[PDB]
Amino acid sequence: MSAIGTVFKEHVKNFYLIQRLAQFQVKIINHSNYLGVAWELINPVMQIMVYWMVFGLGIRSNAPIHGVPFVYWLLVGISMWFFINQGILEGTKAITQKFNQVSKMNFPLSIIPTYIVTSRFYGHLGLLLLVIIACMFTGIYPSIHIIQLLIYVPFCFFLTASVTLLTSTLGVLVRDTQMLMQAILRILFYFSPILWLPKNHGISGLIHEMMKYNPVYFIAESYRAAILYHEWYFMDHWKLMLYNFGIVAIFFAIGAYLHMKYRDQFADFL
Amino acid sequence: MSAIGTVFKEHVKNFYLIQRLAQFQVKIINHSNYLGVAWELINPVMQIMVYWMVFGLGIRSNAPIHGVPFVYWLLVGISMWFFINQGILEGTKAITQKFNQVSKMNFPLSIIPTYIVTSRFYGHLGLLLLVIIACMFTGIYPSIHIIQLLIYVPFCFFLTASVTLLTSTLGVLVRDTQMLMQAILRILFYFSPILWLPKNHGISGLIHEMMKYNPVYFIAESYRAAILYHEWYFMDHWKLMLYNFGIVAIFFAIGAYLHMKYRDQFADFL
Amino acid sequence: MNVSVNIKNVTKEYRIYRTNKERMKDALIPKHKNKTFFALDDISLKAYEGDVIGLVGINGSGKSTLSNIIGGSLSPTVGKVDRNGEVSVIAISAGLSGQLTGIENIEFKMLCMGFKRKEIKAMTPKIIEFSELGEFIYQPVKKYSSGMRAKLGFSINITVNPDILVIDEALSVGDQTFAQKCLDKIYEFKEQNKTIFFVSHNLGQVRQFCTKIAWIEGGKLKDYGELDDVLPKYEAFLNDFKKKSKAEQKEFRNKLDESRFVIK
Amino acid sequence: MNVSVNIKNVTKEYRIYRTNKERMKDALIPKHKNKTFFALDDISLKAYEGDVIGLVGINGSGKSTLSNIIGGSLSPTVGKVDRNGEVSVIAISAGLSGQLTGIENIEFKMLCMGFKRKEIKAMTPKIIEFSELGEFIYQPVKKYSSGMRAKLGFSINITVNPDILVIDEALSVGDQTFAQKCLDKIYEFKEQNKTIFFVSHNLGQVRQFCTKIAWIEGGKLKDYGELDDVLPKYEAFLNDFKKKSKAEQKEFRNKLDESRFVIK
Numbered sequence A, B: 001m002s003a004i005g006t007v008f009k010e011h012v013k014n015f016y017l018i019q020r021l022a023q024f025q026v027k028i029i030n031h032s033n034y035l036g037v038a039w040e041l042i043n044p045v046m047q048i049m050v051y052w053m054v055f056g057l058g059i060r061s062n063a064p065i066h067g068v069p070f071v072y073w074l075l076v077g078i079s080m081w082f083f084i085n086q087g088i089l090e091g092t093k094a095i096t097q098k099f100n101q102v103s104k105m106n107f108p109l110s111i112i113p114t115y116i117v118t119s120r121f122y123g124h125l126g127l128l129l130l131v132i133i134a135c136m137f138t139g140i141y142p143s144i145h146i147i148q149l150l151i152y153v154p155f156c157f158f159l160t161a162s163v164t165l166l167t168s169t170l171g172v173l174v175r176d177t178q179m180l181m182q183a184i185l186r187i188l189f190y191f192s193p194i195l196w197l198p199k200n201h202g203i204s205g206l207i208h209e210m211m212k213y214n215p216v217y218f219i220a221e222s223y224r225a226a227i228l229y230h231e232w233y234f235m236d237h238w239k240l241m242l243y244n245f246g247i248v249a250i251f252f253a254i255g256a257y258l259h260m261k262y263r264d265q266f267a268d269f270l
Numbered sequence C, D: 001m002n003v004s005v006n007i008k009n010v011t012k013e014y015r016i017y018r019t020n021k022e023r024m025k026d027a028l029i030p031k032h033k034n035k036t037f038f039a040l041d042d043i044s045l046k047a048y049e050g051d052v053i054g055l056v057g058i059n060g061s062g063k064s065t066l067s068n069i070i071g072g073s074l075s076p077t078v079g080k081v082d083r084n085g086e087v088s089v090i091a092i093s094a095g096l097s098g099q100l101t102g103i104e105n106i107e108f109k110m111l112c113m114g115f116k117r118k119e120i121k122a123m124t125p126k127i128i129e130f131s132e133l134g135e136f137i138y139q140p141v142k143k144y145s146s147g148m149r150a151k152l153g154f155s156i157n158i159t160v161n162p163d164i165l166v167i168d169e170a171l172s173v174g175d176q177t178f179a180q181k182c183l184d185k186i187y188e189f190k191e192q193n194k195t196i197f198f199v200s201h202n203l204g205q206v207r208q209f210c211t212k213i214a215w216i217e218g219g220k221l222k223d224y225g226e227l228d229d230v231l232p233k234y235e236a237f238l239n240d241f242k243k244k245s246k247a248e249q250k251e252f253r254n255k256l257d258e259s260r261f262v263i264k
């Protein structure tokens, strides 16, 4: 119970420091590139193109879903994936890679992965903006139902960090987890409504019921409801909201407790 | 013309040094893992499982191809992909990452990426062996047509290195190439017979004719012919053999010339 | 006579496993007890105000561990240490990114310590003037020489005002003029009643820098006292060790190693 | 009187761009000519057999660049240098992987130089005995102290027999007993007619180590000669610089910087 309060106080006190360190890391990782920070917008976009050529043109024969063209249906759902994947992959190695340079320095060690995640959120936001701007050419204009983003965009962030704060510590104790993570995330990608929609009423009905436990399902569907479908998502699916809030709370509690228990003995393990 | 001879002499003279350095790098990259070098066999296998659950069980409804079960058809074709992808991705950053530690040391700089590739080939070989061992449970036993591997397994290697020797130098001059490579390889993965077979006689006929220019097509088809189909592959498709040999020669020539021209001015650029 | 730093029974152990796979054995069930190495053992220290204290000892004695414990990057296994102020430590390789330039490194370092951007821009010219870097302040740090990097780090640390300053062989790469400038700065800091710890393997620099001496031999404080008392004993011990034959030196080192290691 | 190393008109320039994006401008079309910095300019050197030559100069003079040019890790812009043998260079931070242990580091280093495994296993005990590392040879290198790492690197380099040996401030971290042992090894190497270059900022170590002195000031060889002739001039220059006021020192540094930079 003291670990949660300690971590919350550390994060609340160092908000601006976290923001500045994330802004500096963004420049650090894009040092020698000629285009600069433009790659943060170029690297995901190309991937989207590939995912439209394979799963949109090849499979599905470019058939629309729910009265919406498949291109924008994929565009809305694919936006958060790059941020989530990159944040989870890089936050697991944040403490291990950058321990010596910060062991001498005097700032809380629980905010090290967080600003790493904050180094990617920026880019996600930019992409999101473009997607909305790209949605007006079909005839889809912003409505009141977009205010729901104020609840949905933060939650995704609060998910990713909640994972990393755990997986960083679990990465220091056992080094094999960094190899297992790459295997897990792929399963979280293909078993999601990002590229396909299950049909139910058969062997895919069990798949549909099992997919609801994936937190990516809720984020993608909520984004689509806010931007595309013009629907208040929380009126029909508040059970998913409560389940995901509980998942986030459990992850945060376990991560904080484990981080505070093994914080002193980091040097012996690493 | 002197660059090709110089690079060939450097590689021929330092064969055992390349092997020993690759063996040492294999141990270096698997230092703190509890399982050790077993992950070199565990990391690809899991991926294969995912690729069987999505494209084999979900799509295609587990339908056999050419009288062979889809599981082994995918197993034979997926074996080389991990080696090719990892070698091309890590060899592009070999000179940039490890320049200072070798600038003081006195060995040829053209053999630096090569042993990096040799750090992965080992693992590929192991996987290949298991695949053959896994093929006997269906009723597929080794035949004389397997001797073709003596021509086909080396060629893939001679392909990957031939790429890296170029992309390393192109990586030093311009840093953006390391970001472009990740975009290219995905296109080389999905437009290949690794997961699907085109139908032709339509809009996929142009796709089928365009896929023959991908060098992964030749490697996958030759492996399947040697192991699964019991067929002398070079009797019907010697044009593809000649085209791929020409591609490899062109890549080697351009890479050697560019490496020898800019070798002296590496420190100023990096 | 203000007690700046007080150390009472500080003791540090390290767990030694020959195999990397034995780390998990003692972490999941607490019944395992392996071999341990005493980096420090029963160190008691009292550093007053306006004091320059020099740590002396042979390689592997435990001076860097004590300096890090004073700084705070390490936590003692047994015992406590209290400091009346803010400490800053400079080492043989400070925190400077090779890819970054001088200005980016400066702003990174002063952002980690918690300074606003206007304060950073106001304090930058003093660092620029003290470093004597000139045009190269705009060039990347990797282009610097070792002395230039040491000057930049020392100026960055000096410009902010610490209550306690620790130097751990940082001046070895710097030349004589930089040493004289640092000596003048140390005199000014003594006038400001700061506490300075100085570690170096150059005995003339120790003589002209320090005023009190702490001698560490095998993790144990052999002697603490004034310069003129402790330093001659250390020099006499060095000459006596030079006199001894190779077998005697090996036996002495083996005895120290036997004392330091224990299975518990 | 065997000419060990000969250097005739060695000159080194570096291209300075304030912006990182200006590198490609001069690489695709050769009409561009930017500002350049003369790291060295018209250096002529003659090192005979059985000579200990010490390089002296203030920070940024160009001693490390000359040592690297002699070693071969750098290529002069104009001029040539010939060596009658095999050279080896030790620096302030040699090649030692932190994750690897001592034995793995030893086998890596002797594999890079081209020794068979049986030769490596035969030569390992000599390195073990010379390093005085003991149990810690089995521990990872990151657990080592700075002096222990320096001892391991020096022993690795010494065990193999080089015709020319270059030391670039490597002994600064080592203590006095290690310095005496290195002095004995240097005497033996002088008896074996090897050529040793020694760089250090400790003038007593230079006096007790070297026999000839080369003075480098702003990339130009001010004076080459015997120890007893060149060293007093350098000391007198240091004292005179200490005498000068801050403005005069700044003017002198600015004049050197003006001389070194040129737009061509």
Ligand SMILES: Cc1c(CC(=O)N2CCC[C@@H]2C(=O)O)c(=O)oc2c(C)c3occ(-c4ccc(Cl)cc4)c3cc12
Residues within 6 Å of the ligand: A053, A054, A057, A058, A059, B059, B060, B061, B190, B191, B195, B196, B197, B199, B203, B204, B207
């Ligand atoms: C069509 C297709 C099936 C379907 C398939 O092959 N199936 C599944 C059920 C049975 C049927 C068959 O047996 O033929 C597949 O699986 O992967 C594909 C991948 C991995 C593909 O990447 C790229 C294309 C593609 C892109 C653009 C254009 Cl213009 C044309 C093509 C593409 C199509 C398929």
Ligand SMILES: Cc1c(CC(=O)N2CCC[C@@H]2C(=O)O)c(=O)oc2c(C)c3occ(-c4ccc(Cl)cc4)c3cc12
Residues within 6 Å of the ligand: A059, A060, A061, A190, A191, A195, A196, A197, A199, A203, A204, A207, B053, B054, B057, B058, B059
């Ligand atoms: C079936 C399927 C289509 C087909 C699809 O959706 N299509 C294409 C033409 C029109 C039709 C449709 O509109 O429904 C797809 O595209 O991706 C998928 C992904 C990305 C999938 O990952 C996992 C499964 C899966 C795995 C195991 C089991 Cl037991 C069950 C499922 C899976 C199925 C599909």
Ligand SMILES: Nc1ncnc2c1ncn2[C@@H]1O[C@H](COP(=O)(O)OP(=O)(O)NP(=O)(O)O)[C@@H](O)[C@H]1O
Residues within 6 Å of the ligand: C014, C015, C037, C039, C058, C059, C060, C061, C062, C063, C064, C065, C066, D136, D143, D144, D145, D146, D147, D148, D173
């Ligand atoms: N993480 C660690 N695990 C085990 N042993 C360690 C660790 N860190 C340091 N040591 C040992 O602790 C002892 C003290 O090291 P250290 O304090 O750095 O020496 P020192 O006093 O600085 N002498 P010097 O080489 O001149 O710096 C040495 O024997 C080290 O090998």
Ligand SMILES: Nc1ncnc2c1ncn2[C@@H]1O[C@H](COP(=O)(O)OP(=O)(O)NP(=O)(O)O)[C@@H](O)[C@H]1O
Residues within 6 Å of the ligand: C136, C143, C144, C145, C146, C147, C148, C173, D014, D015, D037, D039, D058, D059, D060, D061, D062, D063, D064, D065, D066
């Ligand atoms: N790659 C480079 N590009 C530009 N300038 C460089 C580069 N490498 C070194 N220099 C400069 O060349 C000069 C000589 O550096 P260096 O030879 O390391 O000094 P030094 O003689 O070793 N003095 P010290 O600091 O005691 O080592 C310095 O002004 C460096 O900044």
Ligand SMILES: [Mg+2]
Residues within 6 Å of the ligand: C063, C064, D145, D146
């Ligand atoms: Mg130390």
Ligand SMILES: [Mg+2]
Residues within 6 Å of the ligand: C145, C146, D063, D064
């Ligand atoms: Mg130097």
